[PDB]
């Protein structure tokens, strides 16, 4: 034994392409569509819960994940790769920030740490790149609301609104038409649902759509009272019922 | 293609060809058997006499683990020795921590996991032996057979090597014509016969028979080699049956 693959499995080809990163992006292209929209008073991230079999309990599979109380993440591509990245992202938010500064990291810096992890899998010995693209939405005091995309290479970009995966090209076009700098969060949710309906094949309801927001502080979700300055998480996952309520006025 | 060049690579049909090639080395080895009896187990093996210059009785193949387990194998002999050395370390550590001597099913999994581990990486080669082993513990007699893939099961009787087909058929007869049980002393004689019958497929050279056994009544649950008079007796029983 011993891992004797101490050399890079991702290398430059004569044309300057990093093959494994391109192939990782191809895997993301096959992935189910997910998207994010930034409003003035919040951010929305959404995706389709494509269940493999109807016997599967799809609520037990979470595509949208809480990273910190004010930061959430969705993906397109390989689900298992996403799951382990979320575990690592949650841990690095603590080890390299909260245990040092006594507060949760701002969105851009957590994105930076996730990106670094993904970059290292593109250069370190005996590993392949992660086959996912992430959309990370979040809020922090000094930067306000923000939305970032992270790719297999480790590259990240800030967006007003974007989509990744299967029908991203069509979805991005749809988002260019509707997005403006005066959107309220309810308007952004409404647009997210409209955009997502196009790439969805069959059933389109609260049980087949996963959607979360970064919005107002929820003191009812904090779990304790008596510290005025602690006002609760801005990340909230919309219920199946809340999604269906907004699908009527649609 | 090229799926068979490296250990731990799945072929497009979901097979590990290197493990299947290890089986070919096993199939090329001398015949070895195990018979489970009423209160114990019997192990026997065919030793080919390459030349008159081999000292008789002196190149022992059957190996004891701890004091209550016997192991015999067919294929690459050094691979078998390596596996038994590991088995001895596993048995020692078990007894060290838990006091009691290692149960046979426990011991079987220890070898199983170790052999299986040699199918997980391309930096190692699979074991080129099938190993028949067993003995007596606090829940009675146990006989196991372990393949290069790490696969093992419990057996009533077991055989491996070049004469495995012949021996299997002979073992199947004993199981059918003794559905209530077989005594340790009977099993020693039957073991001799089956090796002599299985020797048909290695007929160019003449051979030396070697038997061992662990029985609750005959050996006090300890592994011992069948020597002297009892060995000669089983040789005679076998010689009368091939005529």
């Amino acid at each position: 034994m011993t891992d004797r693959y101490s050399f890079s499995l991702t290398t430059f080809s004569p044309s300057g392409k990093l093959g494994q990163i391109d192939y990782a992006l191809t895997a993301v292209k096959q992935g189910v569509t997910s998207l994010g929209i930034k409003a003035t008073n919040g951010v929305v991230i959404a995706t389709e819960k494509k269940s493999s079999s109807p016997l599967a309990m799809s609520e037990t599979l979470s595509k949208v994940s809480l990273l910190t109380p004010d930061i959430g993440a969705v993906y397109s591509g390989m689900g298992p790769d996403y799951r382990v990245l979320v575990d690592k992202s949650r841990k690095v938010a603590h080890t390299s920030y909260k245990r040092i500064y006594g507060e949760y990291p701002p969105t851009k810096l957590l994105v930076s740490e996730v990106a670094k992890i993904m970059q290292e899998a593109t250069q370190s010995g005996g590993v392949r790149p992660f086959g996912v693209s992430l959309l990370i939405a979040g809020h922090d005091e000094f930067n306000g609301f923000s939305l970032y995309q992270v790719d297999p290479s480790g590259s990240y970009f800030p967006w007003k609104a974007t989509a990744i995966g299967k029908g991203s090209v069509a979805a991005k076009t749809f988002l260019e038409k509707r997005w403006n700098d005066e959107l309220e969060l309810e308007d952004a949710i409404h647009i997210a649902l409209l955009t997502l309906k196009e790439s969805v094949e069959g059933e389109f309801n609260g049980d087949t759509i996963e959607l979360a927001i970064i919005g107002d502080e929820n003191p009812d979700l904090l779990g304790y009272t008596g510290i005025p300055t602690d006002k609760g998480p801005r990340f909230r996952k919309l219920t199946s019922q809340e999604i269906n309520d907004r699908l009527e006025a649609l | 293609t090229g799926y068979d060049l490296s250990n731990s690579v799945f072929s497009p049909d979901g097979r590990n060809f290197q493990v299947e090639y290890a089986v070919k080395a096993v199939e090329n080895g001398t015949t070895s058997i195990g018979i489970k009896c009423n209160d114990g187990v019997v192990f026997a093996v065919e030793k080919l006499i390459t030349s008159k210059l081999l000292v008789p009785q002196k190149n022992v193949k059957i190996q004891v683990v701890d004091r209550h387990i016997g192991c015999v194998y067919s294929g690459l002999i050094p691979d078998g020795r390596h596996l038994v050395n590991r088995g001895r370390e596993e048995a020692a550590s078990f007894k060290k921590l838990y006091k009691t001597p290692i149960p046979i099913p426990a011991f079987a999994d220890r070898l199983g996991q170790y052999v299986q581990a040699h199918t997980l990486y391309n930096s190692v080669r699979p074991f080129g032996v099938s190993t028949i082993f067993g003995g007596v513990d606090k829940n009675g007699a146990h006989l196991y057979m372990l393949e290069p893939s790490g696969s093992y099961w419990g057996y009533k009787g077991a055989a491996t090597g070049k004469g495995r087909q012949s021996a299997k058929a002979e073992l199947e007869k004993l199981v059918d014509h003794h559905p209530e049980g077989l005594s340790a002393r009977e099993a020693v004689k039957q073991a001799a016969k089956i090796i002599y019958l299985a020797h048909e497929d290695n007929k160019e050279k003449d051979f030396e028979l070697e038997i061992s056994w662990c029985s609750l009544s005959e050996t006090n649950g300890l592994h011992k080699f069948v020597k002297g008079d009892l060995l000669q007796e089983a040789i005679d029983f076998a010689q009368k049956e091939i005529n």
Binding site: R4, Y5, S6, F7, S8, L9, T10, T11, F12, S13, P14, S15, G16, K17, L18, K38, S112, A115, K116, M118, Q119, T122, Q123, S124, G125, G126, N143, S146, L147, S153, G154, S155, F157, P158, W159, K160, A161, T162, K172, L175, E176, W179 | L5, S6, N122, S123
Partner: protein
């Protein structure tokens, strides 16, 4: 065993070239153009973002220009993620030096260390090189205003004016023509923008496709200030120099 799948990233060709370094340079040649110009009273860094979408948030974005410390900045050409690994290493080296000697790190010393790191990836370890070329713009009290470049080979050189990324041949010719030693910052700004305007593969050059920065002594009395330009400020300088 594992040898079979080893590309051997750190070997010579029969001609005595390092394959991976050559191919990394080929990768960099497709990156957005970055230009650095040095004047007597400051330095300009100008870089072209790669093809933009209207939904990309520009005012909060940073793809090309990075602050290493208060006196040194870099322009990036190549794989952004690779650049961030090296940038954070450089930022740490600068602080180690400041902690040790109680003086800001001289520009060349920082550049040499980063270049030595790049070099190591070409000689040992069996890993692919960093697909990144840097332009370093900085100031120290020994040599004053300085421009350097480094590439995946780990070789670095000093410049009065230099470009990296796409269309460097064309860009270098244009700088070679219009550059003069007595030139001032406000002229250098105009030169950098005009050079990008002509070498760009886009239809026209606009504020939303540029990152811009200056290192000036332009700061009340003997001291240096870094200015990373806001989008509105790039829009103003484009109008002011008559490009839009």
């Amino acid at each position: 065993g594992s040898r079979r799948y080893d590309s051997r990233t750190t070997i010579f060709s029969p001609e005595g070239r390092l394959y991976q370094v050559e191919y990394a340079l080929e990768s960099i040649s497709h990156a957005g153009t970055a230009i650095g110009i040095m004047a007597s009273d400051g330095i300009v860094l100008a870089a072209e973002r790669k093809v933009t979408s209207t939904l990309l948030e520009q005012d909060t974005s940073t793809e090309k220009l990075y602050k290493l410390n208060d006196k040194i900045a870099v322009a990036v050409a190549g794989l952004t993620a690779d650049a961030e690994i090296l940038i954070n290493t450089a930022r740490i080296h600068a602080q180690n030096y400041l902690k040790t000697y109680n003086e800001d790190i001289p520009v060349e010393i920082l550049v040499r260390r980063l270049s030595d790191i790049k070099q190591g990836y070409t000689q040992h370890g069996g890993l692919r090189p960093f697909g990144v070329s840097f332009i370093y713009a900085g100031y120290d009290d020994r040599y004053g205003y300085q421009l350097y470049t480094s590439n995946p080979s780990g070789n670095y050189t000093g410049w009065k004016a230099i470009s990296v990324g796409a269309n460097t041949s064309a860009a270098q010719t244009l700088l070679q023509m219009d550059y003069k030693d007595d030139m001032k910052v406000d002229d250098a700004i105009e030169l950098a923008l005009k050079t990008l305007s002509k070498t760009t593969d886009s239809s026209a050059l606009t504020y939303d496709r540029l990152e811009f920065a200056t290192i000036r002594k332009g700061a009340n009395d003997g001291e240096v200030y870094q200015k990373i330009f806001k989008p509105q400020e790039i829009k103003d300088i484009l109008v002011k120099t008559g490009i839009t």
